[PDB]
C-alpha cells in the first residue's frame, strides 16, 4: 500500500534557472549532481526533487513510497492483475534513485511512475535551506502534492483509486466559464488532505502545480516577496476551501506552477466526502 | 454505514413565522431560498434545515449521511435485502439537496428518509448567526437529534437497529401516568449520545422534538430570554439523566418542540446500555 | 488590611427552620451548638455561619479577616484615627468566636462588625455537606458576599473605602421605577469580584442578600429544585452583568434572601471601574 | 463478553451491624430497602451492594455486567456449550435487581453468579456518602474486586478463563508456611488490574476479601481511623506488589474482610504476565 | 534575611549507630569524615548533617543560610542592635563548615546558631542514597525543620520573629492532659510551611524532632518498614493538620525523634495565621 | 509473539572484573548469586543480566519474552513447523531462570536462545543502582539490544524475521574499507528502534555490542568519566543515524563492547524502512 | 541599569580566518562589512560580533545594553560619581555601531567598554546560519558571556559590582597546581547564569573565552565535529558545575577560546551564592 509521494523528477530546458529558483526563491537545499540529475533536499532524505536536462519542461516522473519489500510486492501484484505493464527496476536504476527496490510503469496517459521502498536518509548532512525557511512539512505526509491534468477524469480516477489505492477526499466543481464546469478530484493516501488531485484541465503540461508546505506563515510571506521581486507570482495569498492551505502560486522556469503553503488541515478517520463550488475561501487573486 | 444526521426538512403552514423563529430566536443563518425551500445554516454546510410550505406542519424528511459512494451502495443493498422499497434519487433531486448521490425510502410508519453522501460546503461564505450565538456543535456528531413518535416501538426498533444500523445507548421508562409507562429508546450512530430516539408517545406529530447543540451556557441563557419574551418556553432549563444535556424546550410555529442545549456527554467504546426511571436530573419544569 | 469576609451571624426567630434550610436545602454542614449559637460549615474552618435566637430576623454581625496580629493592630489604629469607637474583644468573646484576637465596632448605620485574625481550622473533622454539593468556593476569596442596604450611600462608601479599605469594582444603576434610579456599588478586598455591595434600597432588612458560591453548575441546579419544592425561589437562574455569577435567589426563613451561584469571574490587577445599566445578562426573572 | 463486576449481595446474620459499618465506617450511601434487601450506593447506579438477612454470613451472589443484550446472548451460549446449567432470569428477578435482562448459574464450587445488562442509573438522586469520602473509583473498572477461595485452583481457573473469559494478570506465590506455598491468580476483564483473584486458601468463607477503591489518600487515612476506633483493622496500610494498591484491610461483621484502597495501577495492552514471591512492597502488617 | 535552614550538627555518644541509622534506615549519603565530623548528604550540597562525638546526645548547632555577604552583614547588624553577642566566624571555622562567611551566636536558651552564606556544592559527586529513596525535597525550602523545646515561648517567639525575622504560619494548642495545654508556634522563612516550631514541652532534649522530606509516598512506606524492623517507630503514618505532611516518627540513637514525610503544603502570599486544636488529621498513633 | 528482549547471560573468564564493571562503572544493582550465576538488576525484575564463569568470554544465552502461556505455545509451534529443534525447558531450568515456562533452542549459528513468559518481579526490593544513575529505560521496550555477528546475513535474516517474527527497521551500509561494504540490518519487535541487529562482521565474538539505555544525559556523561578513568572507552560520545541514540561505547572485561546511551527515538505505526550510508550523525570517534 | 551583553568586537591579525571560522564552523551569519568591520549575526539584531583588522588578536571592545535613554543617563552618572572617565559617544560612533546613544570608558585594566541603548533590528533580513544550527539563545539573556582575566580580582570585582551593578552568582576555586588556587567569580545582570566572570589567570589575553549558546544538543554535536576536523578542539564535551552548560571549547584564530554550549540553567529570585571546588561535573577533558 502506498504510504506517500516520496520524490519527483523534472526534465527542463534551463537547469541553471531551476537551480536558482529552487534554492534562492523557495529555499531548498542543493544536494549535489549525480546521474540522477541536480538533487534538492527539504528534509533528512538524500533528495526529494531531481532536475534533469530535457525538452518537455515538465514533470518527468514521480515516485510513490511503500513501507517495505512486502508492500512493493503487493503493489506489483496489484498492477499486474490490472493488466498494467510493470518493470522491476534494475540495480542500476535503484542505485541512481538511491532506493532499495522499485518498480516502474506509467499512468493511463503516459506519466512515468515509480513505486519504491528503502530510500536513503542523510542525517549526517543536516538540512540547511538555501534561503530563510524555518522548515518544510514532510514526515508521514510525504513530499506534498500535485494536480495531474488528464483528458478523461473517470479513466484516471479508476486507475488511481481502484489500482493504486488512493482514497477520495473531496471534489471541487471548477467553473471555467459559462458553458464549462470541470470537477477536480482530490485524493489522499495518508493524513495529508491530498497527495494527488485529478482534473480535465486543458493545459499544455502534465500537472497544473506541485505544492511544498512550510512550517510558518513568515516562511510563506518572505518567499512571496522573493518571488514577487522577479514578477513570478501567479496568484496572491489565499486559503483553499478544501485543504485549508494558506498559499500563493508562482511560475517555475518551465511554466509549471508551484504552490507554496502553510497550515493545511489533515484527513482523519471520521472524514466524509463533500463537494465545493469554489476553490478558495479568500485571496488567491489571479495575477 | 450511517455516519450522522445531516439535514432535516420541515413542511409548514407559516414559512415567515419559521424564518423569524429560526434566525432571531435560535440564531440560525438565513441561507437563501431555492427549489429546496428556505435554507438555514449552523455551520460550513450549504444548509442543514430546509423550510417548505406545506400542510402537515411537521418534519417532512430527514437525511442521513454516509462517508462516500461505497457507503451509499452498502446501505441501498442492506435496505433491499430487508425488502424496503428504495429509490435512487435522480440528478434533479440530488441537485435540489446539493448532494452527490442519494437514495430515498420511508420508515415503517411513513416518514420519508434519505441517505446521501457528498453534501456541499460553503467555507467561502463564512457562517454568521442571526442572533448572538458563539457556535453550534456539529462536526462528526452531525446536526443533532430528534425523537420519533411511533405506534409500535418494537417494529420501529427492529428497522432502525437491524436495518439502518443504529446502536442502543440507553432507555428511559417514561411514567406517563399511574396506568401508563412508555419506554423511550435512545440510539447512536456516532459519538453523540443519541442521533435518534424512539417512543410510543400519543402525539399529533411525527417527532416530539429536534435538538440543536450550542457551544456555551450563555448561548442557551440568552436564547431562553429571547424565546421567553414571546411566551414560547415549554420546559425550563434542566439537565437530562442520559445525555446530560443542559437545555430548555420551546414551541416552534408548527407545534413541534425544539430543544436548545449545551454540554451533552458523548458515547465511547466502553459504553454500556443502562436504564433510567427519570428523564431529568434537575429542572425541565413543564410550563 | 482586610483579607476577606470570614464569618456571619444571624439572629432569627425560628432557629429550627434555619437549621433545616441551611443543611437540607443549601447543603451546609451542621457543626454543633455552642454559646456562639448553632454553627454551620462550608469548608475547613470550624464555622462560617452562626444562627442565634433573636428578634431582628436579620444579619446580626459580620467578621472580616486580617492575616495576623499586625494586621489587626493596623485596622484598630485606622478606625481610631477615624474617630470610630473600637472595642478590643475580650478573651471570652474571642473564645466564643474561636479566634485568636478581634476588635468590635459598628458601621455608620448600626451593623455590628468584627475584624479578627487566627480563626480555627478543623481538618481532623472533614467537611461533609448536608445535601449533595460537590463543594463551596472559599479559600482566599473568603465566605462570599452580601449587599448592605443603607439610607445614605455616600456616607457608607466613605466608611467602607476610606476607613475599611475596600476598593470599588463597579457600579450598577438600578432603575427601580420611572422616577427612581439607585446606584449599587460593588467593592472588593481580594480576588472575589465583590465581598460587599452598598445600595440605598428601601428594604426592611440590613442586607438584600448574602451569597454562597459552589463548585459546579449541577450543585446550583440540584439546589434550585430542592428550594423550588418548597416554593422559596425568588428569582430564576440567570447570570449577573458584573461578577458574571450564574445563580438563583431564594428566601431564607427570615425573609432575607440568599443567592446560590457558580462561575463568578475574579478581579485582577488590570481591572478598571465600569458602570452597567442592568444587573443581569439573562435570566433572574423575579418570581 | 464480561465488561466488569457490577454488583454484590451478602447474606448476613446481623443486618444492622452491616448497615452501620458500610455507611459510617466505609462511607457508602444508604439507598433504601427493597425485596432485594438493604441497598447501598457508591456512584450513579441505583445500588452496588445488597445486604440480606441470611445464615451464611458471606457473599451470596455476584453480578457481572455485559454491554448489551447481544453480549448477554453470547455469554449464555458460551456457558451452555460448556455444559453449565444456565437459567434465564425471570422478569421478577430482573425487577428485583433493577436490570434489563440476566442469566443465573453457579461457579464450579457453588457460588451463585449472575450476568446481566441494563442496570439502573439514578443521576436524579446525587450520590452523598455516609462519611467523608471524596469519591469511589468505578466507571469502566466496575465495582472493585474480590478473592475467591477454592479447593481446586486449576478447575477454578479453567472455568473463569476458558468459560467466563477473564484474562490472567499475574500470580503471587503465597508462602503460607515452610511446607505450604499457594499460588494466587489475579484476573482482569477490563483496565482494573484484577476484578477476580483465585486461591486455594483454607478459609471458612467463599472469599478472602472484597475491595473498594477511593479517590484520595485522605479517604483511606480517615477511614482507617474510623475503623481502628472499633478495633476492626486486620492489616496496616501497605502497598501491594502487583496492583500497587495502597490499602488497609478490616473485618466486616461477617468475618469476611474488606480492603479499602487507593492508587492502584491499571492493565494496558502491552501488559505481560509475571510472578511475585511477596504480596506487598511495604506495610500490610498483620494485626 | 534568612532564606532557609541550611545544615545541622549533632553531638552524640554513639557515632557508629548514627552512621548506620542515617544511611541504612533513612537513606542519606555518607560524605566522608572531616574535622567537622561524619558528614551526610541529601542533595548537591557537600553536607547537610554533621555527626560529632559528644556527651549531650542532641542537636549541637544549626546553620541558617542567607543569600550573600550583604545578607550576612544585615543579620549581624540586626543581632548587634538587639544586644546579642555575635562572633564573626574565623577562617578556620568557615573552612570546617565549608562556607564562605559566617557569624555565630546562641538563642536565648543556649542553642548555638550560625548564619552563613556561600556553602559548597558538589555536583561533580552525584548524590547516591544509602537506601532506596527517590529523592529529598530541599532547594529553596532548605533542609527541613525542627521543633525547638523552650522554657518560655514568648521569650523564644520575640527572638525568632523580631530578631531573626521568622514569620508565624499557625499555632496548634497541644492538650497535654486535662490541666495542661501548650501552644506550639510554627514559623516560616520561605515557602516551606515551617522551618522552625517553638513549644514549651517538658522534654530532656533541645528539640522534639527534626524532619526530612522525601519525593514519593513509597520512599516513606519503604523507610517505615526498615525502621519498624528494629522497633524504632514512635508514631504510625498520619497527616498533620497544619503543614499537611504525611509522615511517621522514629527514634534516633540519641532519643531525639526524626520525622520522615512527604507531600507537605507550602505557604503562599495569601497565607493567613490560623489555629488548630489537633496536630493530626488522621494516623500518627503513638507507639 | 515476542514482546521484547528480557534477559541475557554471559559466560566469562573473570567474574569479579565483570561484577565491578557492571556495578561501579555502569551502575547496575548487584542482585545476589544463585545457580543462575551472579545476578544484576536495572529495574523491578529479579534480574536482567546473569554472569557465569565460562571460557567463551561472550554472550552465553539471551531470553525473549512473550506475554503469556498462549504466546509461548504459538512460538514453540512456529519453531517446530520451521524444523527447529525446540526443547521445553524443565522445571529445574524454569526455576533457575525465575520464569513460569520456557523453551530453548539455538539460532542458525549456535547462539542458545530462550523464549519464556512469567518472569519474577521484586517490587519489595526497590532498585538501588551501584553508581549514580537516575534510571534505566526498560518497560515495554525490554532490556535493550545487541548486534549479532553472523557469517551469512540472509540466512540469519530469514530465521529472525520469518521464524521469530522480528520486523525490519532499517539498514546501514557499513563501509569497512574500499573493497568491503557490509549491510547491518536493524530489527524491532516493539517500540524500541531495534532489539536485534544482524551484520556479517568478522569479529571473534557472537555479538558486536549490547546496549543499555539510561534516563538522562548526565547518566551518560558521568558513566563516561568513570569508564574513561580506566581507559576502557572505545568510541567517544556521538549520535547514531538510525535510532538517534546518544551514546559512547566501552570495552567489557570479555572484549565484547557495551553501548551506554540516552534519548533514542522509537518506531511507530507509520514507520517505513530506509537505508543509511553512515552509522553516526556526529561523534562516535573510534579510540 | 545594564540589561545584558549586547555586542563584542575583536581586533585580529587574520580577518579571513575569522570569517571562515565564525560562519563555517560556528554557523554565524555573515552580515556585511562596514566601517565597524566584518559583521556577524546570530539573531534579529543587525550584528552581535564585529571583526576588525588589528594587532592585539583579542577582544577589542564589549557593549552592554540598557533599556533606554534614562538607563543610559543613570549609568553615565554612576560612572562619573565613581571617578571614571566617561565619553559620550559622538553621532559618528553611534552610527558606526548602529545604536541610538552610547557612552564609552574602560575597565580598571584597559578593556574598552561601551554602554548603549537602541540597537538596530533587521527582521526584514531573516537570520540564516552559515552552517546547520537550529538557533542561538539570546533574547533577554543577551549575547552570551566572557571570562575577563585580570591581575587583581578584588579591584575588578569592586568595579563590576559596585559601579556597573553586576551581581555575584557563585565562585569556583580553581586549583591551578599544588601551590596555586585562584577563585573565579561569576556575575549576572539578568537570568543568564553569568554574563561576566572574573579571574586572575596568567593568560596572554584579555579574556579566557567567550561563549555562544545554541538551541539543541545536535547543534553542539555537529559543530564539535566541524571544529575537530581542523584539530581546533581544546576541551571535550562536558557539563559545568555552576551554570550547568553542556559545552566544548575550541581555539579561535586569535588563540582566544570560544565555548559553544547548550542547556545552561538560569538564575532566579531565590538564587543564593555558593562555592565549588571543580569547574566541571563531567567531561571537559583538556586536549
Ligand atoms: Fe481515507
Ligand atoms: Fe495545491
Ligand atoms: Fe456503540
Ligand atoms: Fe433531546
Ligand atoms: Fe483592586
Ligand atoms: Fe450577589
Ligand atoms: Fe488482557
Ligand atoms: Fe485486593
Ligand atoms: Fe509570610
Ligand atoms: Fe514536623
Ligand atoms: Fe513494525
Ligand atoms: Fe546499539
Ligand atoms: Fe540577582
Ligand atoms: Fe563559559
mmCIF file of N, CA, C and O and ligand atoms in Angstrom, chain D residues 145 147 194 209 211 240 243 245 249 259, ligand 8:
data_model
loop_
_atom_site.group_PDB
_atom_site.id
_atom_site.type_symbol
_atom_site.label_atom_id
_atom_site.label_comp_id
_atom_site.label_asym_id
_atom_site.label_seq_id
_atom_site.Cartn_x
_atom_site.Cartn_y
_atom_site.Cartn_z
ATOM 1 N N UNK D 145 -13.005 -5.557 43.261
ATOM 2 C CA UNK D 145 -12.644 -6.962 43.064
ATOM 3 C C UNK D 145 -12.826 -7.794 44.324
ATOM 4 O O UNK D 145 -13.120 -7.260 45.394
ATOM 5 N N UNK D 147 -11.483 -11.840 46.112
ATOM 6 C CA UNK D 147 -10.647 -13.024 46.013
ATOM 7 C C UNK D 147 -11.503 -14.218 46.401
ATOM 8 O O UNK D 147 -11.994 -14.295 47.525
ATOM 9 N N UNK D 194 -7.156 -6.339 38.626
ATOM 10 C CA UNK D 194 -7.893 -7.573 38.754
ATOM 11 C C UNK D 194 -9.278 -7.305 39.282
ATOM 12 O O UNK D 194 -9.477 -6.386 40.082
ATOM 13 N N UNK D 209 -11.486 -11.509 50.597
ATOM 14 C CA UNK D 209 -11.861 -10.105 50.790
ATOM 15 C C UNK D 209 -12.478 -9.551 49.520
ATOM 16 O O UNK D 209 -12.423 -10.194 48.470
ATOM 17 N N UNK D 211 -12.851 -5.571 47.603
ATOM 18 C CA UNK D 211 -12.153 -4.308 47.681
ATOM 19 C C UNK D 211 -12.964 -3.180 47.082
ATOM 20 O O UNK D 211 -13.728 -3.393 46.142
ATOM 21 N N UNK D 240 0.452 -3.132 47.670
ATOM 22 C CA UNK D 240 0.619 -4.444 47.043
ATOM 23 C C UNK D 240 1.620 -4.404 45.896
ATOM 24 O O UNK D 240 1.754 -3.391 45.194
ATOM 25 N N UNK D 243 -0.927 -5.020 41.987
ATOM 26 C CA UNK D 243 -1.813 -3.949 41.536
ATOM 27 C C UNK D 243 -1.378 -2.573 42.055
ATOM 28 O O UNK D 243 -1.916 -1.552 41.637
ATOM 29 N N UNK D 245 -1.877 -1.193 44.788
ATOM 30 C CA UNK D 245 -2.914 -0.553 45.588
ATOM 31 C C UNK D 245 -2.362 -0.239 46.983
ATOM 32 O O UNK D 245 -1.681 -1.078 47.591
ATOM 33 N N UNK D 249 -6.768 -3.438 55.464
ATOM 34 C CA UNK D 249 -7.820 -4.449 55.475
ATOM 35 C C UNK D 249 -8.534 -4.361 56.817
ATOM 36 O O UNK D 249 -7.929 -3.980 57.836
ATOM 37 N N UNK D 259 -11.072 -4.657 51.815
ATOM 38 C CA UNK D 259 -9.847 -3.927 51.532
ATOM 39 C C UNK D 259 -10.340 -2.569 51.029
ATOM 40 O O UNK D 259 -11.233 -2.504 50.182
HETATM 41 FE FE1 LIG H 8 -7.332 -6.804 46.883
#
